[PDB]
Backbone as JSON Lines, residues from 0, in Angstrom:
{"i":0,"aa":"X","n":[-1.96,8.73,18.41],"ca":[-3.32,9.22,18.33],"c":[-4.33,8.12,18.09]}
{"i":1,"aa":"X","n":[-4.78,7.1,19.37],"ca":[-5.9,6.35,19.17],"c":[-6.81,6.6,18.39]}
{"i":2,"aa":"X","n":[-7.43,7.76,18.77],"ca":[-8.48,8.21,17.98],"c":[-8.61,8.79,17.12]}
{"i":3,"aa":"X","n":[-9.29,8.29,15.74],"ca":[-8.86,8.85,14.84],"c":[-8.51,7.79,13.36]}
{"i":4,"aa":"X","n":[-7.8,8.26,12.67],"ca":[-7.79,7.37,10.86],"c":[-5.48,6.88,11.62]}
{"i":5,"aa":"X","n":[-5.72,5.56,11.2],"ca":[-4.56,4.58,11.54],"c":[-3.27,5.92,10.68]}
{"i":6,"aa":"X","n":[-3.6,6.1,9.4],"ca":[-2.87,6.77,8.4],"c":[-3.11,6.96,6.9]}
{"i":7,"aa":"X","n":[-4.19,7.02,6.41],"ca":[-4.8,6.52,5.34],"c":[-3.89,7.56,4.41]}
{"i":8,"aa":"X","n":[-3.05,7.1,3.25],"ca":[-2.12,7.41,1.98],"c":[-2.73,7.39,0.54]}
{"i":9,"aa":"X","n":[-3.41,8.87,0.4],"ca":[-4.16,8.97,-0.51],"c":[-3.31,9.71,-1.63]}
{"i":10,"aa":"X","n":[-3.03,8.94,-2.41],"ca":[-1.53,9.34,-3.56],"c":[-2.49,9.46,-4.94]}
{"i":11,"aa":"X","n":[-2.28,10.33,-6.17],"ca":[-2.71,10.76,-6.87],"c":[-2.29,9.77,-8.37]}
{"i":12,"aa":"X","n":[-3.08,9.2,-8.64],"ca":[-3.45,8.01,-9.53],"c":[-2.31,8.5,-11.06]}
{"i":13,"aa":"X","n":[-1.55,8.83,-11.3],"ca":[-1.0,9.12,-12.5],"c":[0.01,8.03,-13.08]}
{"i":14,"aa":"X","n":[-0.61,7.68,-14.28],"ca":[0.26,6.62,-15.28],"c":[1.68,6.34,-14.61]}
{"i":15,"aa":"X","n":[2.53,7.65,-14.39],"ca":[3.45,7.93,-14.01],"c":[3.98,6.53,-13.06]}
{"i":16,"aa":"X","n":[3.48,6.49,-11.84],"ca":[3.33,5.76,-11.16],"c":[3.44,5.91,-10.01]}
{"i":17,"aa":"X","n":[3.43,5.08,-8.97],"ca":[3.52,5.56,-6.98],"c":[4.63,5.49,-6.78]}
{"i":18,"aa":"X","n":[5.48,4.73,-6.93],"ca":[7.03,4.53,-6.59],"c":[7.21,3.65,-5.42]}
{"i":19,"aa":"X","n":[6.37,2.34,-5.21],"ca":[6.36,1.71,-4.08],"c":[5.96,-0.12,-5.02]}
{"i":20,"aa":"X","n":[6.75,-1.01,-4.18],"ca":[6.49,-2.5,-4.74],"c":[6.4,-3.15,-3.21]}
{"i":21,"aa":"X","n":[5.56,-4.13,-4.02],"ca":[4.93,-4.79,-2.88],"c":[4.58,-6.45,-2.95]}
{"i":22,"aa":"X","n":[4.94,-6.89,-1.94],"ca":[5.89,-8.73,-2.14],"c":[4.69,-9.29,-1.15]}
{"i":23,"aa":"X","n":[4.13,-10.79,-1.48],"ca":[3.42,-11.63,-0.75],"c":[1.74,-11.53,-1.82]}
{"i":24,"aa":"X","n":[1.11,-11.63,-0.54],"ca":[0.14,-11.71,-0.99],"c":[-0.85,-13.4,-0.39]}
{"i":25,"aa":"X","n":[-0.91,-13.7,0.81],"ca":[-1.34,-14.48,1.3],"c":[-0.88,-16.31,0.12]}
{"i":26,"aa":"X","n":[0.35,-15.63,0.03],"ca":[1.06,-16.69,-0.71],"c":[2.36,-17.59,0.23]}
{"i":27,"aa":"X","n":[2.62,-16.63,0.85],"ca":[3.82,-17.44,1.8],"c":[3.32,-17.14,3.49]}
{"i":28,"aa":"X","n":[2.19,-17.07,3.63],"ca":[1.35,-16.7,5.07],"c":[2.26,-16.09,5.84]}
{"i":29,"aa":"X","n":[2.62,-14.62,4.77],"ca":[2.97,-12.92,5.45],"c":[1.99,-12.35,4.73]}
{"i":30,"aa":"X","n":[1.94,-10.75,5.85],"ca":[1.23,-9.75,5.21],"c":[1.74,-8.87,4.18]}
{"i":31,"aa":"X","n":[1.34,-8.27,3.54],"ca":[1.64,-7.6,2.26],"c":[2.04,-6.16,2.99]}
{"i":32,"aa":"X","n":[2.95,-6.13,2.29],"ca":[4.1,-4.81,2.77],"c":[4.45,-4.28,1.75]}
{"i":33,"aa":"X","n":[5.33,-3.02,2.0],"ca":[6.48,-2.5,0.91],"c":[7.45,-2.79,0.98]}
{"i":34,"aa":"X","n":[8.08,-3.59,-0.34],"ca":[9.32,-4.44,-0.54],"c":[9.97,-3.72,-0.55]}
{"i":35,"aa":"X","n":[10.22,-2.72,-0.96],"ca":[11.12,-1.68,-1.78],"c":[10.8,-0.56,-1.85]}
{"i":36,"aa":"X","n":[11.28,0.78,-2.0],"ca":[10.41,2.32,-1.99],"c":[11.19,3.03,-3.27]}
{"i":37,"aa":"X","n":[11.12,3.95,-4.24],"ca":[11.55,4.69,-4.9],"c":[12.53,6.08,-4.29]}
{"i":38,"aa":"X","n":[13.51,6.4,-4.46],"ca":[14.26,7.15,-3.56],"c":[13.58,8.7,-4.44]}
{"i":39,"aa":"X","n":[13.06,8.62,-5.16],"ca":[12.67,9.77,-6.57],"c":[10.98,8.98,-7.34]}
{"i":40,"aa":"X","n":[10.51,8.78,-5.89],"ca":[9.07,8.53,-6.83],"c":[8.11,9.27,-6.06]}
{"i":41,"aa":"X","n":[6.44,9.14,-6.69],"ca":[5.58,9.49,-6.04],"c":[5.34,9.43,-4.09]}
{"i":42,"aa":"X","n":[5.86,8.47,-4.15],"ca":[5.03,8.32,-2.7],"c":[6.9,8.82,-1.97]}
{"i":43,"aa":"X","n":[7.55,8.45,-2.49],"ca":[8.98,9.26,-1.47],"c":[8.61,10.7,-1.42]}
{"i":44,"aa":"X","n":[8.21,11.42,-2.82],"ca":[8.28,12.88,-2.89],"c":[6.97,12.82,-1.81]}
{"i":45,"aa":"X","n":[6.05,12.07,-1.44],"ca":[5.04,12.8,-0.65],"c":[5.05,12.19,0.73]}
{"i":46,"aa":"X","n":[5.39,11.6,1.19],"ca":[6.26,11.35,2.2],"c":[4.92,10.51,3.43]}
{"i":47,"aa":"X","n":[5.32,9.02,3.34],"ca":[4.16,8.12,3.85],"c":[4.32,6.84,4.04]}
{"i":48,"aa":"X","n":[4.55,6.57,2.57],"ca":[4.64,5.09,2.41],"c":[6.52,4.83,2.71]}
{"i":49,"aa":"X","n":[6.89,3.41,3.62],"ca":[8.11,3.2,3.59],"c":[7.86,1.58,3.52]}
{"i":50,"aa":"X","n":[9.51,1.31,3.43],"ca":[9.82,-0.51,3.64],"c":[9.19,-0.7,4.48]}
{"i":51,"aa":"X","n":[8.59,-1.2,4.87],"ca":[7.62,-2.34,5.76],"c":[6.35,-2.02,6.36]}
{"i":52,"aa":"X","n":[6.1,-1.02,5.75],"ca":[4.98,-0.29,5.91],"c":[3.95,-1.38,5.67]}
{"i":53,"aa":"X","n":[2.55,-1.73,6.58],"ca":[2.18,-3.15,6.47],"c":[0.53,-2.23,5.33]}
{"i":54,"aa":"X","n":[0.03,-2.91,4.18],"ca":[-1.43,-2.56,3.91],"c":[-2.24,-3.26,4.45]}
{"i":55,"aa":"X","n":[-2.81,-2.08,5.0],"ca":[-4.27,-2.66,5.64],"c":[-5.26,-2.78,5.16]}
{"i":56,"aa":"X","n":[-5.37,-1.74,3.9],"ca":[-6.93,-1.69,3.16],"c":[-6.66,-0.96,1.6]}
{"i":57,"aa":"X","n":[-7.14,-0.61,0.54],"ca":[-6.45,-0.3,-0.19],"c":[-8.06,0.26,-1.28]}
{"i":58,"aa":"X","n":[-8.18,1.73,-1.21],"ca":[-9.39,2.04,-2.12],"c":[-10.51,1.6,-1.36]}
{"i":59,"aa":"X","n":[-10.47,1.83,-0.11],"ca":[-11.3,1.04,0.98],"c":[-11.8,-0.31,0.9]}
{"i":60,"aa":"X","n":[-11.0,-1.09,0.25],"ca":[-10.98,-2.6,0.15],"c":[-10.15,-3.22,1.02]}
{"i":61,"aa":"X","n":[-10.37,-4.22,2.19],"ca":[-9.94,-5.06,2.9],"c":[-8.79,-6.17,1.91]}
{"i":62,"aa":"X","n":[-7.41,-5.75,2.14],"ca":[-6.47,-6.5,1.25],"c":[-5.6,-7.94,2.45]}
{"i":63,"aa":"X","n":[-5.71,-6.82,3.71],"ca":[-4.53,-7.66,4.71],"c":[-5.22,-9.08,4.84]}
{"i":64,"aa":"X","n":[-6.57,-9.61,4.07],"ca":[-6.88,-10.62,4.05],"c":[-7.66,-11.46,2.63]}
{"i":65,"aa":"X","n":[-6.42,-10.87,1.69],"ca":[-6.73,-11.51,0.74],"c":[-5.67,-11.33,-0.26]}
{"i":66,"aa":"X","n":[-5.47,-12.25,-1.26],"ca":[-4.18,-12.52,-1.96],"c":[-3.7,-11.09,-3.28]}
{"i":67,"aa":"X","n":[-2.52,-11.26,-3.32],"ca":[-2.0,-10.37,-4.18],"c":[-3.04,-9.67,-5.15]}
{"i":68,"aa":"X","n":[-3.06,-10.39,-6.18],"ca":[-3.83,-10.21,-6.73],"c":[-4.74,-9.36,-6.9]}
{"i":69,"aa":"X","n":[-5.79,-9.74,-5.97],"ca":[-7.13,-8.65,-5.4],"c":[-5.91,-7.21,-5.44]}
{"i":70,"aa":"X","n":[-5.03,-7.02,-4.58],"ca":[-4.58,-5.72,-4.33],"c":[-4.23,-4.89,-5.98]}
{"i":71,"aa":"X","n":[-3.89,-5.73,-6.88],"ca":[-3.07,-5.19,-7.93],"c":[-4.6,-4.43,-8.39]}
{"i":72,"aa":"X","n":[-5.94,-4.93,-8.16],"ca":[-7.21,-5.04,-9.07],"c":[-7.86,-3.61,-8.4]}
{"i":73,"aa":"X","n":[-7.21,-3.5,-7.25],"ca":[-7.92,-2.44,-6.22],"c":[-7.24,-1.34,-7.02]}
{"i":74,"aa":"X","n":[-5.81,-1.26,-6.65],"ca":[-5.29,-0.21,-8.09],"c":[-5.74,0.44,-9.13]}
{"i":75,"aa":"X","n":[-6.12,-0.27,-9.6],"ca":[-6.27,-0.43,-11.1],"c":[-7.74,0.2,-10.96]}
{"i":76,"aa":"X","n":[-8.45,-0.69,-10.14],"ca":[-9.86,0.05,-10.07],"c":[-10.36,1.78,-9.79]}
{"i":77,"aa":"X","n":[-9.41,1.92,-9.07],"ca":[-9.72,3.62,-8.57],"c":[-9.68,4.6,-9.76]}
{"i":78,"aa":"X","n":[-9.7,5.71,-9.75],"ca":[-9.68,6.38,-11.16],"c":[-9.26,8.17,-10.18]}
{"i":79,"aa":"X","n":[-8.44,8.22,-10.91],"ca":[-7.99,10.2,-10.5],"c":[-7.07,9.95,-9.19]}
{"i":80,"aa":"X","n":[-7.52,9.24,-7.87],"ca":[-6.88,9.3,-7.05],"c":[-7.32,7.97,-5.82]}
{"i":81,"aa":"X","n":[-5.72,7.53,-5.67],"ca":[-5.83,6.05,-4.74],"c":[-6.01,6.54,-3.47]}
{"i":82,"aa":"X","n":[-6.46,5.39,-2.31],"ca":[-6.69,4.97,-1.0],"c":[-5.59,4.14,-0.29]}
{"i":83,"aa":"X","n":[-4.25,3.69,0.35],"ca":[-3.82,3.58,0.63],"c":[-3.39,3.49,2.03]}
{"i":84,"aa":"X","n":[-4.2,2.57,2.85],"ca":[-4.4,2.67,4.14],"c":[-3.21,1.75,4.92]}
{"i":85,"aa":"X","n":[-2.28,2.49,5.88],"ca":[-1.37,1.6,6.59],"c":[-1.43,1.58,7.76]}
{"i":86,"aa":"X","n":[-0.45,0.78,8.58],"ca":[-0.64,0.81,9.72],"c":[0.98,1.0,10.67]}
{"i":87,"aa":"X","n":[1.03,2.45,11.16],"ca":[2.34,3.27,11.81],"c":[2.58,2.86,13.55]}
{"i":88,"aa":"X","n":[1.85,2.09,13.5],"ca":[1.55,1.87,15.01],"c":[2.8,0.89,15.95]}
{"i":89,"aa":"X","n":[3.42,1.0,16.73],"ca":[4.49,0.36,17.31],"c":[4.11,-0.97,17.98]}
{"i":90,"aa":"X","n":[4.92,-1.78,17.37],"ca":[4.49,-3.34,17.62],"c":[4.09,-3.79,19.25]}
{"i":91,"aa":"X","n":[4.97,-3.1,20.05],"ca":[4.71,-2.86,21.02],"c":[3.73,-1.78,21.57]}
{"i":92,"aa":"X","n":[3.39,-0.87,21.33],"ca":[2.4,-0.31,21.69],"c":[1.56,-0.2,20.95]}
């Protein structure tokens, strides 16, 4: 579906946590992905985020071009409920 939102993963902000980790950070010139997924967490039970799922934007903040860091701050910043924007799209198409 060209037209239209890439996949935007709007997961519900609780202490608890998302159930997703995430490796890089314009530290080893890769993009920031999901390292790892929770088989029993937030984002498995809601069904979106996976391993290599690439972030594109995060709380509508541009992350895929800027270091770890910034992303942990985007987190942290939202309040009640996150933004979580990826990209499902086939490398080839």
């Amino acid at each position: 579906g060209s037209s239209g939102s890439s996949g935007v993963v709007e997961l519900p902000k609780t202490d608890e946590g998302l159930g997703f980790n995430i490796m890089g950070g314009k530290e080893q010139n890769s993009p920031i992905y999901i390292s790892r997924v929770i088989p029993g967490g937030v984002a498995d039970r809601h069904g979106g985020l996976k391993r290599g799922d690439q972030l594109l934007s995060v709380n509508g903040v541009s992350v895929e071009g800027e270091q770890h860091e910034k992303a942990v701050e985007l987190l942290k910043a939202a309040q009640g409920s996150v933004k979580l924007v990826v990209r499902s799209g086939p490398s080839s198409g």
